[PDB]
Amino acid sequence: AVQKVVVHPLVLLSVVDHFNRIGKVGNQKRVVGVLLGSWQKKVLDVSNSFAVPFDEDDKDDSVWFLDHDYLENMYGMFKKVNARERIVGWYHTGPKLHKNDIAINELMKRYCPNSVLVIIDVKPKDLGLPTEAYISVEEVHDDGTPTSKTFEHVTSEIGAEEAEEVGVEHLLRDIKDTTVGTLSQRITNQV
Amino acid sequence: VPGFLQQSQNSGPGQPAVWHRLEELYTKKLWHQLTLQVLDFVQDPCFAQGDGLIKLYENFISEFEHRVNPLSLVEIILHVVRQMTDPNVALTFLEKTREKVKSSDEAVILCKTAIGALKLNIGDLQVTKETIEDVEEMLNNLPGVTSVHSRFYDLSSKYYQTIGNHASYYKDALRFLGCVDIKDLPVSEQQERAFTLGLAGLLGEGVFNFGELLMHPVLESLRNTDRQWLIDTLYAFNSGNVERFQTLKTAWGQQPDLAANEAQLLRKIQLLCLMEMTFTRPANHRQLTFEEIAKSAKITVNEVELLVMKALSVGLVKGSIDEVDKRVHMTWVQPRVLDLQQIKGMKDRLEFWCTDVKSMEMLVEHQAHDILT
Amino acid sequence: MVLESTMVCVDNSEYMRNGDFLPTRLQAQQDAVNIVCHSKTRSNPENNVGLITLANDCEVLTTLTPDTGRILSKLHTVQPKGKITFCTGIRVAHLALKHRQGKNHKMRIIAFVGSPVEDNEKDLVKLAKRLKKEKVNVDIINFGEEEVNTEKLTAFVNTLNGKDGTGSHLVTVPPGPSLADALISSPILAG
Structure with missing residues (x-):
């Protein structure tokens, strides 16, 4: 029963520079990361996220890597910069899903009332909507x-919160x- | 206690083919293949004398083994009950073994479903609701065992036979049909269960879309050797009215529990005939005259009004029926279950829509072409 | 000390629950993880020994870390009921051991197997020559019991390595009357 959120593409530019990381680190082609935020109502807003160093085997596709050196102490960092912007979910590219998405969701579901796998769009040529949400379901x-x-x-949308157009509408x-x-x-x- | 199976070792001819091995299992002291030896004494046709004596050693397993899940202990009390033929000591013994044999797994569900399975000697409706309800109180977390969901079907189906919801056998039969999808027992018993499934879902009515999952394979593979018109009367409530001999052959052949609400069955031929008559014709004249209703729905002019006000109570069609012309008006309906030939030949609506709204989009844009600007 | 990232798996599948030696085999697998983790606690304070499971998934619970006590708390209720798999532990350990430190250590594996495990002859021979191509020496262990005339782990021992091999050996375990430190003492010598 979740309709829409408010999206700041600032940490989507962090998705962009991690899309710069993966083009020059190695064998990881797709951008997989972790989406911070705070449930406010059925409408929601996101202010920060981060991008896991992730690998995924082509053979037995349920091979995740979500380091707790990269989760716990970086969570301490992200908790030290603000207590409000904590976890709300994660994100990976493509439009469809890979297999391990369910377990990657259930990993950080232990931290959050509803962890969300917003599947993100790095090379937008699509026919419908941008990045879109998925809630925990028992159907x-x-x-x-x-x-x-x-x-x-x-579902979800790309909502606009407030000012930021000092940057944006000058850009x-x-x-x-x-x-x-x-x-x-x-x-x-x-x- | 080694001497216990030294004296209770020989249990038939060719039974020491597992008892000469059992006299070395407990020397090897193992309990995986000895849990499986409980399961194999179930598998080989034991007439309940080795288990009915080894039950004191099952108490001893609870004493000094203290690691194996009590799956086999619940198994072994419900297989000593052939020696026992009395559950009233087995109930306190089983809750004793519940509270004295520990594990990390889901044990309250297997214990209360075994109590539900041996509850049939109690004179039901007194303790069933309480602990059968406690089972689904502890089913939400993870039904990973799901033979506990099969036993949950069995207690829920004797709980259906505690009278009161006569088409909860259909949803409960979905719980049976998906307790384990492979039906893991031969065809004959469950095709007689499909026989009485058709009956017990037919005659009672809490369900309204009764002709729905007839396409499901694990029931129709049972029906293929049933009586050859129970299939056809289930098709007379799947298609929906137009098999006159079948919507009457329910009044010809199938007699028990028929005449109480075959008037409601012929109410549902009319409820289903509405969605028939407004689906199978896609076309207009949706201010239909009452004439096809009163002809093919076996109803009269004074009862078409009840035929659709009872459908207003149903809530799948809510027509604005004319009453100066007596015309039975068609509004929105609940359409069908499956038209696979029209799932293929819906192109004359889907591709119709696609290319024609596309073409007229191109035409609107093509008449407002050079104000692209 | 010899440089490797010795990877220990927990034999938390359905065949480590009987009472044949001690009244438990959790003592066998659990005190074996104890002795190997204290050996990598005393051996060098730069290793990485956490955990990996074989039961139905490869859940990396905590970080592949120098410390051990959190993992020794997780060995308590290790939950030995599940599907044993000899193929997934080594593969996710290979990618986890490609997710390592400034690399002071090579790749070593001990895989606690207490079952006639499910792995094709083609699967073991491909895994073993991939560890030939990927420079890994594995110390192959059987706890619990394995079926007589063992086929999988012994042939993984056979075709595992070369060009400085000398890691691949297997101790077969019978289900007799003995004790659990004598079921880790027979594989503590030659994994």
Whole structure:
């Protein structure tokens, strides 16, 4: 029962520079990281995250690496800079899922009321929406198996909190507020 | 106590093919293959005399073995109950072994489902609700055992036979059908269970979309050798009315528990005929006349109003029925279960939608083309 | 001391629960992790010996760390019920041991197996020549019992290494009347 959050792409630029790390460290092609934040209501806001040094075997794909040298003492750091912005979830790229996502969620679920695997978009060419959320679910079936845990589409958006446009709307240098009904509507018609 | 199986060793001819090995198991002192030797004394047809004596050594296992899960101990009291034929000492003995044999695993669920399984000698509806409910109180965490969910079906199905919810056998039969998906016993007993499944889901009515999971393989592979019109009357409530001999063959052949609410069964032919008549024709004239209703729904003019006000109580269709022309108006409905030929041939609506709203999008944009600007 | 990151697995699967030597085999596997972890506590204070499991997943609980007492608390309720796998421990240990320090140590493995484990002849021969190609010497141990005329771990011993090998050896264990320090004392010499 979660609709939408508020997204600061600042730590998505941290996703960008960890996307710079993975292009020059080694065999890790995809960007996998950990998404801090704070449940505020069904609407939510995120202020920080971090990016795990992660590896994943192509053979028996349930091979995660989430170091507690990189979790616990960096959690002490992120707790020392603020007590508010603690864990709320994690993130990896692609749109779909890999297999180990369920266990990577359940690892940090012990810290959080609802850890979220927001699947993130580094090379955006998509047809729908950007990065999107998934909440802990128990839907199992009408058949009655042991309890299902594959985290279902419980959506998200890219919300805008507050000011930051000192940076952003000076960094635009191109764009314009269309006085709606001035081919903005047919941009929307196209899309 | 080694002398105990020195005197109780020989238990038949060819039974010392596991007892000459058992006289060295406890010298090797092992308990994995001796837990499996309890399971193998279950497997080989023991007439309950080695276990009914070794039960004091099972107390001794609880005394100085103190590591193995009491799975086999619950097994061995419910296999000494053939020597016993009395559960009233076995209940206190089993909760004794619950509170005196420790493990880290889920044990309260296996203990209370074994109490549910041997509860049939109690005269039910008195202790069933309490501890059968306690089982699902401790089922939320992790049903990883899931033979405890099978025994939970069995106590829940004798709890269905504690009368009161006559189509909870269908959802409970989903718990049976997914307790273990492979049916792990031969075809005949459970195809008679599929026989009485069709019956006990047919005649009672808490369920309303009764013709639903008939496509499921583990029941229709049982039905393929059943009587050849129980399949067809389940199809008469799957398709929904138009098998007159079958929606009447429920009144021809299947007699027990029929005549109490076959009027409600023929109420559901009408409830299902509504979704039939407004689905199978996609077209308009959704202010339908009452005529097909009163012809094929075996209803009268004075009862079409009840036919759809009882459906307002149902809540799958909520028509704004005309009453100056007496026309039974079609609004939104709950459509079907599966039309796989129309899951394939929905292209005439889906690709219709896709390319035609796409083309008319291109046409609106093509008439407002060069104000791209 | 000889430079390696000796990796210990916990035999926390379904066949380490009987009362054949002591009334427990948790004492055998648990005091073996005790003696190896205190050997890497006394041996060099730069190693990395934490834990790895074989039961149904490879859950790296704490950090592959110099200290040991948190892992020795986790050996208590090690939960020996699950699916034993000889293939996943060595592979996730290979990637975890490619997630190491400024590397003072090579790669060594002890894999506590108490079962006729599930690993193809093609699987063992591929794992063993991948450790030929990846420069690993493994000290192969059997606790609990293994089925007579052992096939998997003995052939992993066979085809494991070369060009400075001398790690791959296997002690077979019977399920007799004996004691647990004499079921770690027979594999404490030659893993």
